[PDB]
Ligand binder design. Sequence first.
Ligand SMILES: CC(=O)N1C[C@@H]2C[C@H]3c4c[nH]cc4C(=O)[C@]2(C1)N3C
Length: 130
Amino acid sequence: SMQEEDTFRELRIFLRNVTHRLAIDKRFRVFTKPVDPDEVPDYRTVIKEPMDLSSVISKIDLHKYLTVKDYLRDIDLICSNALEYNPDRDPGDRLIRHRACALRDTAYAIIKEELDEDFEQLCEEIQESR
Ligand SMILES: CC(=O)N1C[C@@H]2C[C@H]3c4c[nH]cc4C(=O)[C@]2(C1)N3C
């Protein structure tokens, strides 16, 4: 229905606003674009599904996310990729792991404060009907 298409349009407006707020935070600059395969040639042998905040906005605009749950699976993949590629005790690995955990915790905290639980349940019920 047109009312269901209006629901998904509101979901996209909300996800673009959350993603912009993460992308301007100086702590998260390393997660704003794909890892450059020229600069890091073993990256795509270790990490089988690369993800970053520029790819996330592209996916919102392609109508890939029909729930906040499917959006958070990609925020979780940005964080888990950083923990798996950079697992060592040295300061550069520890700094990126700390930033990755802060990106995930910031996204979940914005959604807990600003997403209505009945708006998410409506999106999940339209998705399950398709
Ligand atoms: C997000 C993530 O896991 N990394 C690991 C890469 C290694 C190191 C680097 C050196 N030159 C480009 C680089 C990157 O893009 C990354 C981003 N680092 C900063």
